[PDB]
Write a protein that binds this ligand. Sequence first.
Ligand SMILES: OC[C@H]1O[C@@H](O)[C@H](O)[C@@H](O)[C@H]1O
Ligand SMILES: OC[C@H]1O[C@@H](O)[C@H](O)[C@@H](O)[C@H]1O
Ligand SMILES: OC[C@H]1O[C@@H](O)[C@H](O)[C@@H](O)[C@H]1O
Ligand SMILES: OC[C@H]1O[C@@H](O)[C@H](O)[C@@H](O)[C@H]1O
Ligand SMILES: OC[C@H]1O[C@@H](O)[C@H](O)[C@@H](O)[C@H]1O
Ligand SMILES: OC[C@H]1O[C@@H](O)[C@H](O)[C@@H](O)[C@H]1O
Ligand code: NA
Ligand code: NA
Lengths: 103, 103, 103, 103, 103, 237
Amino acid sequence: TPQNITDLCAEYHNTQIHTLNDKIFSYTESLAGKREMAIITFKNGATFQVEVPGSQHIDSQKKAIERMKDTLRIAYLTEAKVEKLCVWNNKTPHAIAAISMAN
Amino acid sequence: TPQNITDLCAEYHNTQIHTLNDKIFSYTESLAGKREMAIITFKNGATFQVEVPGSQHIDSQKKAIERMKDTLRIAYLTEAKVEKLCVWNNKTPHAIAAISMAN
Amino acid sequence: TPQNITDLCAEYHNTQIHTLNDKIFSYTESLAGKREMAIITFKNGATFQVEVPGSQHIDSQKKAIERMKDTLRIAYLTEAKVEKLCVWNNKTPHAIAAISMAN
Amino acid sequence: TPQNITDLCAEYHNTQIHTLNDKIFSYTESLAGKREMAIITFKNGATFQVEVPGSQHIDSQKKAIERMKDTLRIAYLTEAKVEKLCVWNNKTPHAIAAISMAN
Amino acid sequence: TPQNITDLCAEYHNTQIHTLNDKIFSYTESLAGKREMAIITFKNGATFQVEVPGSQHIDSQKKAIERMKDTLRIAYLTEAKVEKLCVWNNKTPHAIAAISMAN
Amino acid sequence: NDDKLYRADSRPPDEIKQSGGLMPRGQSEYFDRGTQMNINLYDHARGTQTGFVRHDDGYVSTSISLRSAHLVGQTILSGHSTYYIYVIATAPNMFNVNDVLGAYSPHPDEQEVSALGGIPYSQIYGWYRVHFGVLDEQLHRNRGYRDRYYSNLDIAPAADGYGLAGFPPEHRAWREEPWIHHAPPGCGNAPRSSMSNTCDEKTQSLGVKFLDEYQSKVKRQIFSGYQSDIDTHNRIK
Ligand SMILES: OC[C@H]1O[C@@H](O)[C@H](O)[C@@H](O)[C@H]1O
Ligand SMILES: OC[C@H]1O[C@@H](O)[C@H](O)[C@@H](O)[C@H]1O
Ligand SMILES: OC[C@H]1O[C@@H](O)[C@H](O)[C@@H](O)[C@H]1O
Ligand SMILES: OC[C@H]1O[C@@H](O)[C@H](O)[C@@H](O)[C@H]1O
Ligand SMILES: OC[C@H]1O[C@@H](O)[C@H](O)[C@@H](O)[C@H]1O
Ligand SMILES: OC[C@H]1O[C@@H](O)[C@H](O)[C@@H](O)[C@H]1O
Ligand code: NA
Ligand code: NA
């Protein structure tokens, strides 16, 4: 069982860590059909999505996708510093798998 | 997969972008039957709705409609600057499809 | 489709607008059986309820009732100024149908 | 239909009002099996629970129990003054039925 | 029925209390398949998880796990002082069973 | 209690909102760490009021009445065709300068109360517009303010301010009451006060710690409010 996001990320083949150590610059949210998703950017231009729920997600991920969208919204609004993102890099933009926050 | 709200908006018929770069001036919320909806206005007088769930929405939109109403409420209360709205313009008032927030 | 709370209120029998332009003075919440409801008061003594879900509500209202109780809680705690309530006046206390908040 | 917590409390057997007029001193939360509950204390030593969901609750209470635990958490964190609790006094510690916040 | 986290913790095999009296240093959250979990650390290096829902959890715990992840996120962001954690110590990192916060 | 303080300032409300409050000179946003700036009350109080109302060296000064602040505004902010008087709640980020600096307060005449780290948006009750010296007696209420929280708080006791007083080490204040009993290391008769710079450092670090702890209180109040919409029942059905 991983004790940090880096160890967690290393358990998956199609993942990588981004180190940001910065607050989210922009938060975007959509309810348009087939694009029920969220997008965040950082001021350095890096862009990430929370994927539309699909058949590549198992049932236990569905609730976690919703949680992640919650987390990003509140992170944006409180200007919380994001340390690292773990993302799947076989998507454009890269798809968030995990987030870590520390001051 | 779009990387911003403008790209997202362009994927849909009967949509357009409004650029506001301002906090929400008013937020309205209703639980009256057949009018379970939200309305927001900006100080320039622009007015937008989150549509009542209906047959024009697919099932995956239902959760996102609820999310959007959450987002607008908290945006209003925190006086967050809204950057852009993507809206369907074949409704009156224009119906929100996506929102973006930036510093 | 109404563009404001006043227009919305006018669509329903047995409704009226209260103009408060004040923060909520008190918030009350119950989980007692058959009384799962919320009550708010203003400093002028005005008192309002969110009704217990019942057979007078259609299914689409159920989620909106829950949302409204959320909205009132967070409105109370952030000391947000409430502009107007639309209420059914064939109940005691008057039952909230819609709320508007404005800068 | 009651217009305040005192009137509400009087409708139930085995209930009592506590008048606290103070912020919550401590909040405790558990996900341990059979003890999925919350406990709050005040500085005067008074201690209250939100009961584990059980067969003494009807279905309509289940959502309200969850709401109450939300309310208490956020009440604790915002240091909101609790006016009165309505509690069932045939439990130890006393079980919250309703809360009122003012001032 | 326990009146505090210490009494609660004592009801379970393989649990122990940590007294931290400190804010959370880091918060991590994952939606990666089979690792839908949260991790927190304190500045003294102590590390704790909310476990992935599994067969060691009864159904009533599922909602409480979700609640606990909410609580930790909000605790992190508000810089709330955590008093004590009750944890299962037959997991690495130690798995949170309960949390207490006090003024 | 619900006592208010007042500060004439040229920075308008939109800039205050962006900065997250009324900022010391040098500080961009309220929730920046204290390491950004020099935090020293003595230094703050000695500053010249030429152009701006004192806001140097990690503190922002306020007056104890609307009238005081308007008068100060007409002296200092003579030149701005519009400035604002910010109405400000009392809270324990706020020190009475004359009490803390005592007999060494360099401007006892002005009875100033100063905020360590600046004044967060949430602590600002509202503002008056001042157009060509003419106060407009219609107050604008700040929607970011929390009356119930701040009405419950008062300014800091002087005893909480003595250690942060920020006299140089060789100063006789550290060798007299009350300050002697609150003196940082290296200050006063602590060995090598004149040679060490240990004094000015501990002053800084005690200041930064104070702001850290105070920022935690603000975050907890405001950001808890922001999360009071959460309904667990939605997600668990
Ligand atoms: O579990 C979510 C992930 O699923 C994988 O199969 C896919 O390669 C990723 O793009 C991501 O969608
Ligand atoms: O899904 C939401 C959208 O659905 C479309 O069919 C309709 O043209 C839009 O006005 C909007 O309702
Ligand atoms: O939809 C809720 C409303 O339903 C009506 O039928 C009733 O007359 C009102 O008092 C209110 O309960
Ligand atoms: O609905 C919850 C309540 O149910 C009652 O039957 C019980 O006597 C109370 O102690 C309380 O548990
Ligand atoms: O209820 C969950 C708990 O179940 C126990 O049996 C186990 O020893 C703990 O590690 C924890 O998983
Ligand atoms: O859906 C679960 C909950 O998620 C929260 O983040 C949201 O603010 C609430 O309104 C509720 O929707
Ligand atoms: Na990897
Ligand atoms: Na005060």
